[PDB]
């Protein structure tokens, strides 16, 4: 059992409804006004091809930028520089409105409604796992703290071998309807998150998409709210976004927290200027200034054993759902696989928002290009 | 086979993607932007309880009117005289630019869009529907012409037993999505239609939703669009709307035509309105003024042996998707299970929009209660 869960709707029972009871009674009264939660669905547009590219600036600084975007598979660029877009670029076929799976980048806004949470004193880092899910007990989450969570520094047997379907990436995602059930797979995503074991040891780095769901489900403990409102009320409600952003739930309605997010560009830059903003957004302050100071500060870098990620920052490490680069400009950022990128760039005050889809999840060859536009326009963005 | 369909993006091989797919490359850059088509998903707020009424004029003639609708499991309710909204209500907890499955009602958009091919020469109702579709022949669309299906008055074999799950009416929905597989269930929508039978027989009315998603597949190997694409090209992209309209989708992108639409309350009152102007929208003319008028027309009397219909409309009938009430008003109406209604009152130039959420699909009992209200409402707004 994962004990109890936010309900769909109003008085809902456990798990319901299912694709087989929405159109009952009284779960159709909810169903018809969110069917997209239920059945795939696509967007009938209200509005009756070509590239746009607007790189403004710092185009005379990279001339051959927009070359590098395509050979980075972008599909949508975006510079803010303090409370301006002064670049943008979107592929042939994507609208600057239209909104982009964040993969990863997930994560980080995963940990800032955590962040908001510790502010109000519902979560105590310090507290181990269990304190909020007591279901996780037997699991790689008994003993390990919420703060080594939200730091990823717990050994968990995580296959992430993809080909493999026995893997746990991939049951992982089988767990959460990002693709096909077989025989034997656990129900839901909480469920999932109960069967993972490890050697009990912690304090090293390892990345794992697990634990941002743990950290989503320690968030609807706490508040009693769907991660998917939680993540609406705590962060999402106070951008003044333009679109709602959307995200993939289970079969519980649980959002896929660690990398089910969609939304445009534009609107996730206004994570980003939050963060520069030491925490404040236009409908109020989502987390505190020592939350975005700490996140900016990074984590132990001795944790960050990831030589895919210290080979190009050296002093990088990672903390609170974001990647520190420890570079010389303390660059900071959200990294989703096939190359989506929520990169912060303090000195500048700016925020760059690149979502892409390279061909491959990760490869040395996309992180070297794509690290490389990065840097690249955030030194273009220095004053001369 | 079910033949050639529209690729779900440009290039894409039949039936890409597929929910274990969507991650790979080519498929990739197409689903990290349209996610929502293959996995349900969840929206969430850029907005940070109780019902809405403003039923203004009306209110006078019709006191209890608020009343009769809670009593009707009214969700949205919005009444356009002219162009101009005089009457509104929403439950709490639904918002005026929520968007709600219009079931049925969704056939009177797919009629629509056939009317509009009609109009261009691409589509003769007197056809056969083998014109168009080859690979239904051997089926009880084999001899059928279109217009038949459009009028809906072709003899199927189709049970409409939703208890039972070896009925037509059930292993449609699973067929597209709208339930969990079976064990040997048609792949698709399209394979579904291609499994009907019938006793050949033509003339009398037989209200099947199996005809809708014909027509949709109809309009797809006419146009060479997607019927997503389709209804909002021919239709919803010329209504100037507020919001897009969403459409389920099933394995293969087809939208499903004759149930799965969802849009505002407003946006729909759009398509009445379109209708009362002769066919002709903000964006430009979506069908024939003759079209409308063959509508408004209402089909053979002598076809329709619904006595659930019959037995309040003594005259009424069907045609190109639009029940015809054949009463003293001349009342044409889009209806769907649950309580959805696009009804359209030429005699004060209105359009009156119900959606509900009935704890049945379908009773004498809601009917009765529902037509009273939308009556009551049409006469509320002659002039005195």
Redesign the interface.
């Known amino acids: 059992s994962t004990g109890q869960h936010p309900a769909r709707y109003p008085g809902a029972a456990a798990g319901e409804p299912?694709?087989?009871s929405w159109?009952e009674?009284?779960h159709?009264?909810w169903?018809?006004?969110?069917?997209?939660?239920?059945?795939?669905?696509?967007?009938?547009?209200?509005?009756?091809g070509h590239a746009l590219a607007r790189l403004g600036a710092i185009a005379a600084q990279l001339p051959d930028l927009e070359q590098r975007l395509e050979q980075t598979?972008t599909?949508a660029f975006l510079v803010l520089r303090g409370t301006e877009v002064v670049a943008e670029y979107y592929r042939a076929g994507?609208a600057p409105d239209?909104?982009?799976?964040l993969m990863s980048v997930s994560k980080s806004l995963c940990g800032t409604v955590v962040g908001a949470l510790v502010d109000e004193g519902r979560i105590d880092p310090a507290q181990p796992v269990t304190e909020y899910v007591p279901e996780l007990a037997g699991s790689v989450y008994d003993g390990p703290s919420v703060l080594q969570v939200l730091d990823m520094q717990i050994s968990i047997d995580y296959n992430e071998d993809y080909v493999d379907p026995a893997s746990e990436v991939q049951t992982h995602d089988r767990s959460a309807?990002?693709?096909?059930r077989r025989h034997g797979d656990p129900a839901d995503t909480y469920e999932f998150l109960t069967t993972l074991r490890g050697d009990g040891s912690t304090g090293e780095f390892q990345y794992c998409s697990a634990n941002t769901d743990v950290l989503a489900w320690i968030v609807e403990r706490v508040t009693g709210l769907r991660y998917?409102?939680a993540?609406?009320?705590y962060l999402?409600?106070?951008?003044?976004?333009?679109?709602?952003?959307?995200?993939?739930?289970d079969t519980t309605?649980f959002?896929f927290a660690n990398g089910?997010?969609?939304?445009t560009a534009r609107?996730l830059a206004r994570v980003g200027r939050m963060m520069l903003d030491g925490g404040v957004a236009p409908?109020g302050r989502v987390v505190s200034e020592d939350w975005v100071r700490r996140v900016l500060a990074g984590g132990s870098h001795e944790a960050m054993t990831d030589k895919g990620f210290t080979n190009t920052f050296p002093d990088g490490s990672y903390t609170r759902q974001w990647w520190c680069t420890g570079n010389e400009r303390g660059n900071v950022s959200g990294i989703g696989i096939?190359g989506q990128n929520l990169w912060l760039d303090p000195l500048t005050d700016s925020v760059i928002v690149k979502?892409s889809?390279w061909?491959?999840?990760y490869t040395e060859h996309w992180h070297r290009l794509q690290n490389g536009i990065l840097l690249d326009v955030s030194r273009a963005l220095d004053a001369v």
Chains 1, 2 share one sequence.
Not at 38 to 45: C, H, I, N, R, T
Not at 177 to 180: A, E, M, N, R, V
Not at 236 to 249: E, G, H, M, P, S
Not at 260 to 263: P, Y
């Open positions: 299912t694709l087989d159109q009674p009284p159709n009264r169903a018809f006004a969110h069917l997209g939660e239920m059945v795939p669905s696509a967007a009938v547009s209200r509005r009756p598979y599909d994507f239209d909104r982009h799976l309807g990002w693709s096909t998917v409102e993540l609406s009320t999402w409600a106070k951008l003044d976004a333009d679109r709602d952003a959307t995200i993939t739930v309605g959002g089910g997010v969609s939304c609107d409908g096939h979502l889809s061909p491959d999840p």
